[PDB]
Write an enzyme that holds these catalytic residues in place. Structure first.
Site, PDB file in Angstrom:
ATOM      1  N   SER B  76       0.852  -1.176   0.000  1.00 41.96           N
ATOM      2  CA  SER B  76       0.000   0.000   0.000  1.00 41.96           C
ATOM      3  C   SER B  76       0.894   1.234   0.000  1.00 41.96           C
ATOM      4  O   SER B  76       2.115   1.134   0.181  1.00 41.96           O
ATOM      5  CB  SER B  76      -0.944   0.011   1.185  1.00 41.96           C
ATOM      6  OG  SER B  76      -0.222  -0.243   2.383  1.00 41.96           O
ATOM      7  N   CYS B 310       4.600  -1.726 -11.184  1.00 43.20           N
ATOM      8  CA  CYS B 310       5.361  -0.648 -10.566  1.00 43.20           C
ATOM      9  C   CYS B 310       5.571   0.498 -11.553  1.00 43.20           C
ATOM     10  O   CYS B 310       5.403   1.661 -11.199  1.00 43.20           O
ATOM     11  CB  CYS B 310       6.694  -1.138 -10.007  1.00 43.20           C
ATOM     12  SG  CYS B 310       6.499  -2.208  -8.558  1.00 43.20           S
TER      13      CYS B 310
HETATM   14  C1  LIG Z   1      -3.578  -4.535  -1.359  1.00 42.16           C
HETATM   15  S1  LIG Z   1      -3.451  -5.701  -0.011  1.00 42.16           S
HETATM   16  C2  LIG Z   1      -3.365  -4.626   1.461  1.00 42.16           C
HETATM   17  C3  LIG Z   1      -2.564  -5.358   2.549  1.00 42.16           C
HETATM   18  C4  LIG Z   1      -2.263  -4.554   3.825  1.00 42.16           C
HETATM   19  N1  LIG Z   1      -3.484  -3.905   4.397  1.00 42.16           N
HETATM   20  C5  LIG Z   1      -1.203  -3.485   3.529  1.00 42.16           C
HETATM   21  O1  LIG Z   1      -1.590  -2.300   3.603  1.00 42.16           O
HETATM   22  O2  LIG Z   1      -0.028  -3.872   3.229  1.00 42.16           O
HETATM   23  C6  LIG Z   1      -5.170  -6.279   0.129  1.00 42.16           C
HETATM   24  C7  LIG Z   1      -5.330  -7.249   1.282  1.00 42.16           C
HETATM   25  O3  LIG Z   1      -6.719  -7.636   1.434  1.00 42.16           O
HETATM   26  C8  LIG Z   1      -6.800  -9.047   1.407  1.00 42.16           C
HETATM   27  N2  LIG Z   1      -8.131  -9.438   0.948  1.00 42.16           N
HETATM   28  C9  LIG Z   1      -8.692  -9.223  -0.290  1.00 42.16           C
HETATM   29  N3  LIG Z   1      -9.929  -9.646  -0.378  1.00 42.16           N
HETATM   30  C10 LIG Z   1     -10.213 -10.150   0.885  1.00 42.16           C
HETATM   31  C11 LIG Z   1     -11.369 -10.744   1.431  1.00 42.16           C
HETATM   32  N4  LIG Z   1     -12.493 -10.925   0.741  1.00 42.16           N
HETATM   33  N5  LIG Z   1     -11.328 -11.127   2.736  1.00 42.16           N
HETATM   34  C12 LIG Z   1     -10.193 -10.930   3.428  1.00 42.16           C
HETATM   35  N6  LIG Z   1      -9.043 -10.397   3.012  1.00 42.16           N
HETATM   36  C13 LIG Z   1      -9.118 -10.014   1.719  1.00 42.16           C
HETATM   37  C14 LIG Z   1      -5.602  -9.492   0.570  1.00 42.16           C
HETATM   38  O4  LIG Z   1      -5.259 -10.852   0.722  1.00 42.16           O
HETATM   39  C15 LIG Z   1      -4.543  -8.557   1.168  1.00 42.16           C
HETATM   40  O5  LIG Z   1      -4.148  -8.936   2.486  1.00 42.16           O
HETATM   41  C1  LIG Z   2       1.001  -7.060  -7.623  1.00 50.27           C
HETATM   42  O1  LIG Z   2       0.523  -7.084  -6.265  1.00 50.27           O
HETATM   43  C2  LIG Z   2       0.234  -5.909  -5.607  1.00 50.27           C
HETATM   44  C3  LIG Z   2       1.261  -5.110  -5.087  1.00 50.27           C
HETATM   45  C4  LIG Z   2       0.979  -3.920  -4.411  1.00 50.27           C
HETATM   46  C5  LIG Z   2      -0.333  -3.483  -4.245  1.00 50.27           C
HETATM   47  C6  LIG Z   2      -0.562  -2.166  -3.501  1.00 50.27           C
HETATM   48  C7  LIG Z   2      -1.828  -1.279  -3.755  1.00 50.27           C
HETATM   49  C8  LIG Z   2      -1.986  -0.781  -5.172  1.00 50.27           C
HETATM   50  C9  LIG Z   2      -1.003   0.089  -5.653  1.00 50.27           C
HETATM   51  C10 LIG Z   2      -1.156   0.590  -6.938  1.00 50.27           C
HETATM   52  O2  LIG Z   2      -0.192   1.414  -7.411  1.00 50.27           O
HETATM   53  C11 LIG Z   2      -2.276   0.229  -7.721  1.00 50.27           C
HETATM   54  O3  LIG Z   2      -2.473   0.684  -8.982  1.00 50.27           O
HETATM   55  C12 LIG Z   2      -3.829   1.031  -9.296  1.00 50.27           C
HETATM   56  C13 LIG Z   2      -3.243  -0.624  -7.221  1.00 50.27           C
HETATM   57  C14 LIG Z   2      -3.110  -1.127  -5.945  1.00 50.27           C
HETATM   58  C15 LIG Z   2      -4.230  -2.047  -5.497  1.00 50.27           C
HETATM   59  C16 LIG Z   2      -3.933  -2.658  -4.125  1.00 50.27           C
HETATM   60  N1  LIG Z   2      -3.178  -1.718  -3.251  1.00 50.27           N
HETATM   61  C17 LIG Z   2      -4.054  -0.547  -2.991  1.00 50.27           C
HETATM   62  C18 LIG Z   2      -1.362  -4.288  -4.750  1.00 50.27           C
HETATM   63  C19 LIG Z   2      -1.097  -5.487  -5.426  1.00 50.27           C
HETATM   64  O4  LIG Z   2      -2.136  -6.234  -5.911  1.00 50.27           O
END
Ligand SMILES: C[S@@+](CC[C@H](N)C(=O)[O-])C[C@H]1O[C@@H](n2cnc3c(N)ncnc32)[C@H](O)[C@@H]1O
Ligand SMILES: COc1ccc(C[C@H]2c3cc(O)c(OC)cc3CCN2C)cc1O
Ligand SMILES: C[S@@+](CC[C@H](N)C(=O)[O-])C[C@H]1O[C@@H](n2cnc3c(N)ncnc32)[C@H](O)[C@@H]1O
Ligand SMILES: COc1ccc(C[C@H]2c3cc(O)c(OC)cc3CCN2C)cc1O
Lengths: 335, 335
Positions: B76, B310
């Site tokens: 994130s 990225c």
């Molecule tokens: C973009 S990552 C954000 C991870 C973390 N909050 C961070 O900021 O690094 C989205 C997270 O939501 C989880 N996730 C997505 N859909 C979900 C669901 N339906 N129930 C629970 N976790 C879910 C993914 O596996 C991951 O841990």
């Molecule tokens: C390839 O795996 C991932 C790696 C890092 C992220 C970080 C972040 C993020 C960062 C972006 O720059 C982006 O572009 C629209 C979309 C998203 C969606 C989910 N989250 C908010 C999400 C991933 O799914």
């Protein structure tokens, strides 16, 4: 160049229209400079600071009113389809817009808060004979005017509550509550919205229309010492211009269902029509006011006030082709 | 110029960085053309149409993850004070920002939804030893990783719920619920928000952070046939980019208390750091992935996917000096 000076020349009719417009436009331009931030991060910080501060908080003879405003004396932004739309048509068109946006249906109880001269009350009552339409106003003159019009139009489904909405207490609920150009005058919005919710059932809808800026909120008051206009028009510092989105942060007791704005050119066309009609009927207007006011100078003062309001309103709402100050509308249900 | 063609040259590493950035930037520029309307009247009509439509609706080895992302594998937007802020510092700074904005206090029960690799969980647990911190994730790998880290760091106040948040049922409530880069993946936002409210008491606070556009919402999907990027990055059409204000219309069950955005340059600096660190550890990364993936070609595919993510993310969040796509944050209490 002092303001006492500018007020003198203004009251003596010695400022030409072209100059008057230019000066007021400049004052609004300064308001825009004050309100727009360089980043959305800062814009929201500014906007949220305004919202948080909010959460811690003689009548004109109707004959005069009839000579300056449109037929139903609507005192709010009208709606102009054509270049040829008259103020009368514009009044009607905005009445119908409200009916559609507020989902008015025959047979509903309807409450109009800050109903004014009751153009909207009379429109709904006539159009929907099974509705019962209540206007609420704090003005004895307005109540009297509406009641007289209802009688002339053979309308039996109209009542008027004479009350300060901020003090009015009732167990009565209504299917539809309409708030038109009234929320701008409300000192405590959170408490206002809360009270409105107590006059609603799960089936009710609340429709609110207010002048806004698209981006930021502001009190209608002078920024600097060079602003003679704001305090002239509103000498009480009692009018708030919410942003188009501000009411989204006031969903403690009501929930949003829809959200619109109407481009500012509609309001601009409104105040322009009032100004022209006032100019047209200037002599009559001067005669009408003389009894109640005393001096012909006190007359000219009232007229200057109203005309300048119209002149300034034009610059305000037409700024950037209506894409600065405009009208916001929202539909809510009860929580 | 077909997309099958562009994908070929991309997978074969034959598109230079400068060209790749330019092509992706162009795709985002088209998204901006699609999203901005000429009037606020039309902007809201468009935005409300999006909101109304909403209301009718193999894992990477942690060793690879550690070689591409910062120390706590935050997935994130991070927060960069200086030109010299490392990804590790940026992770920490955004953790502290969340703690302040969500009003985390020692002794609270805290739930982190979509907790990922648990950087935030671990940060709160270590900083506030009397808090009890629950992460909720749908990934077995993530649960395992967090639990291992808690053990290494001598943290006794961490548990992880393995669950699909959209199916999870519990009578348990929490003082603080945090939702970071997770709401973007939620199919039904109104129902999500409603469920969250059932896990709150009158004293609870809910903090949500999501990528946004400042002005309009959009699904992350191809506009036209020329967009090879969107579907490459997200091959499920399952990511929603809400506007900075969209969640204001989702206060059926929660009420807003504060609202911020973080300029997009922070996210841009985030993905840039990931990209650079991945480039740095390219050989190691290739080695790590080979066992679980089979082919060295399947390796290159995964790496191309991540790197392009990225590269594109950089163009997206840095557009107009971070003043297009950015991060929105909101604080709510229960109704
Ligand atoms: C973009 S990552 C954000 C991870 C973390 N909050 C961070 O900021 O690094 C989205 C997270 O939501 C989880 N996730 C997505 N859909 C979900 C669901 N339906 N129930 C629970 N976790 C879910 C993914 O596996 C991951 O841990
Ligand atoms: C390839 O795996 C991932 C790696 C890092 C992220 C970080 C972040 C993020 C960062 C972006 O720059 C982006 O572009 C629209 C979309 C998203 C969606 C989910 N989250 C908010 C999400 C991933 O799914
Ligand atoms: C700008 S006028 C709008 C009138 C009417 N709704 C229209 O659109 O023509 C504001 C109205 O609210 C009324 N008003 C202002 N404060 C009020 C209060 N506290 N209680 C009741 N009416 C109030 C004024 O007297 C007037 O009728
Ligand atoms: C002089 O008496 C009045 C005449 C007409 C209106 C119409 C309208 C309105 C129109 C404007 O153009 C304006 O400028 C900011 C402010 C307001 C505030 C109240 N209402 C929303 C209000 C009055 O008080």
């Amino acid at each position: 160049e002092s303001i006492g000076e500018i007020m003198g020349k203004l009251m003596q009719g010695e400022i030409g229209d072209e100059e008057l417009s230019k000066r007021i436009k400049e004052i609004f331009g300064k308001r825009l400079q004050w309100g727009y931030k360089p980043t959305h991060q800062q814009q929201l910080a500014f906007n949220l600071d305004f919202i948080k501060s909010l959460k811690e908080m003689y009548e004109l003879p109707s004959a005069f009113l009839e000579a300056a405003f449109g037929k139903t004396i609507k005192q709010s932004g009208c709606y102009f389809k054509d270049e040829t739309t008259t103020i009368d048509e514009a009044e009607e068109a905005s009445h119908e817009l409200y009916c559609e946006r507020a989902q008015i249906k025959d047979g509903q109880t309807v409450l109009d808060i800050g109903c004014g001269q009751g153009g909207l009350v009379l429109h709904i009552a006539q159009k929907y004979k099974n509705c019962h339409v209540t206007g609420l106003t704090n003005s004895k003159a307005q109540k009297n005017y509406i009641l007289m019009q209802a009688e002339k139009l053979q309308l039996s489904n109209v009542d008027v509550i004479l009350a300060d909405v901020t003090k009015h207490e009732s167990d009565k609920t209504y299917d539809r509550i309409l708030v038109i150009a009234t929320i701008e005058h409300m000192k405590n919005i959170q408490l206002f919205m809360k009270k409105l919710s107590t006059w609603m059932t799960e089936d009710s809808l609340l429709f609110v229309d207010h002048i806004c800026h698209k981006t930021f909120s502001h009190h209608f008051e002078a920024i600097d010492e060079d602003d003679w206009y704001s305090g002239f028009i509103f000498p009480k510092g009692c009018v708030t211009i919410l942003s188009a989105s501000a009411l989204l942060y006031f969903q403690d007791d009501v929930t949003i269902l829809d959200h619109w704005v109407v481009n500012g050119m509609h309001m601009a066309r409104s105040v322009d029509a009032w100004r022209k009609k006032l100019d047209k009927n200037m002599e009559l207007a001067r005669e009408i006011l003389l009894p109640g006011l005393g001096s012909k100078e006190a007359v000219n003062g009232v007229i200057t006030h109203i005309r300048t309001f119209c002149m300034g309103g034009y610059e305000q709402f037409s700024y950037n082709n209506g894409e600065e100050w405009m009208v916001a509308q929202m539909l809510f249900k009860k929580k």
